[PDB]
Design a protein around this ligand. Structure first.
Ligand SMILES: Cc1cccc(C)c1OCC(=O)N[C@@H](Cc1cccc(Br)c1)[C@H](O)C[C@H](CC(C)C)S(=O)(=O)c1ccc(F)cc1
Ligand SMILES: [Cl-]
Ligand SMILES: [Cl-]
Ligand SMILES: [Cl-]
Lengths: 99, 99
């Protein structure tokens, strides 16, 4: 697809068998989702945004689809204002910025 | 150009005669720069997200050059940790997400 930016680039993702809405965010190094259950062990991580740093849970090698494109990678979970797809998965699905 | 997302998409901008580095951020609704002077009227605004909110000054109808592409739009000024080019100006230079 080709996605313009006159509105938020919100897409449907699938993780854990469930459909969720998420923002394609080239401003984000990593992917962070609202509180949810994921399998396995997690590791601690700090991420910094406009107001400061938050603590999140880091889960590795998690299956996730983005607009139907299947990916496998690191997913962070924590008190994010919105589900964010960051560059770690955007790169996996072959996303680039063009003008 | 086509900009890869293997790395943060930082680009050179020109504003108020100054050259600065800024992040092309599809996740940001608006453009926000570190503390600087700009011409004209302004109004206070709060913007927020991970780590909370910050107070900014909103200036409208500000000319900016992004990778040599001229645009006009609202610029927010305040204690952001990084300069951010948001969708309000990305649209004007014709920037799209593609995969
Ligand atoms: C999710 C994530 C994981 C690891 C590392 C990073 C940087 C990251 O993204 C965090 C995030 O908050 N990114 C911002 C842009 C940003 C902000 C601070 C530092 C860096 Br570096 C990058 C996200 O792309 C844009 C945000 C919004 C997002 C949380 C929906 S925002 O900055 O809060 C914003 C709000 C309103 C505006 F008008 C403009 C910008
Ligand atoms: Cl912890
Ligand atoms: Cl990953
Ligand atoms: Cl604008």
């Amino acid at each position: 697809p080709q996605i313009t930016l006159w509105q938020r680039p919100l897409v449907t993702i699938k993780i854990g068998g469930q459909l969720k809405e998420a923002l394609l965010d080239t401003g984000a190094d990593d992917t962070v989702l609202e509180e949810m259950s994921l399998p396995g062990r997690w590791k601690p991580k700090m991420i910094g945004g406009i107001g400061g740093f938050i603590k999140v849970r880091q889960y590795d090698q998690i299956l996730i689809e983005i607009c139907g494109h299947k990916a496998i990678g690191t997913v962070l979970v924590g008190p994010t204002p919105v589900n964010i797809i960051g560059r770690n998965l955007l790169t996996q699905i072959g996303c680039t910025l063009n003008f």
